[PDB]
């Protein structure tokens, strides 16, 4: 199964490039090991969009 | 008047002499980055040149308008002119220089259109220390 | 609403603007995706807010034996459009080159320096 989940987590890193999301590798790892423990996805959404948004208010 | 704005383009001269000079290995790798921090300050001088050729060639850059445009860069200009005229005389290089130009901020810590120019080049400087 | 069919809702989508063999791997990926669940839901909301040749395509040369199709002849427009997007893209690389520095030759003076600001 160790196998297993590096192999998921592989497979899982193109639909998060195609469809044009925020994530890259490093926001991949942060979010699957947050939605491990059972934290809600709908409320991790706008937490993504104001970490790319609040830097760009800057400039 | 023309002897008032005279001293920008002698405070140029062994400015381009630091840059086409100091750029060499044989001055150390602190004269490097020293002189690629008074290189880009060069540029900015160039920008201010081109911006005011635009202006005279409508009739509308005048000794007055240039004067008063020039009178904040003979705090930026003529600050580069001591620098390089301490540093190059004698053989000043890595920290004997950097000890120099924290002597040169406390030179220069009540003008500060000085100042911020005395900050970068010596944030520059440290780098390859 | 299950996890593996959002993932082929958005392979028609895929299918609709071209790029066939795209949406093939697509499916040949949803069917180990779910014979993680909470990540995908997090991935149709993010879908499309993010930050922004080949010698198999057109050609029968190559190939120990090609399959016969008889002429087509019009996908040779569509090989101009192949061109036509990187002679595009070096076109507009130098509409933002000479851009940036007519804006530097031509300002109002005092703006290219901040030190001239004080």
Redesign the interface.
Known sequence: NLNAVRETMDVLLEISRILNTGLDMETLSICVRLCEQGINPEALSSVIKELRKATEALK | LVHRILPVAASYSAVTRFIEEKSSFEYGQVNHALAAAMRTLVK?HL??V??????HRQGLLSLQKLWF?IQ??M??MDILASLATSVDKGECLGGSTLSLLHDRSFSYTGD??AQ??CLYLTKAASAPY | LPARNKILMLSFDLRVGGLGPKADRLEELVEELEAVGSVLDLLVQLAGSGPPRDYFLNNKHVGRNVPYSGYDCDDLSVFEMDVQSLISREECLCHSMIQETLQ??????????P????
């Open positions: 900015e920008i201010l081109s911006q005011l050729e635009q202006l445009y904040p860069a705090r930026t500060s259109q911020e120019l | 530097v030759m031509e300002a109002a003076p005092g703006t290219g320096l030190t001239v600001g004080l």
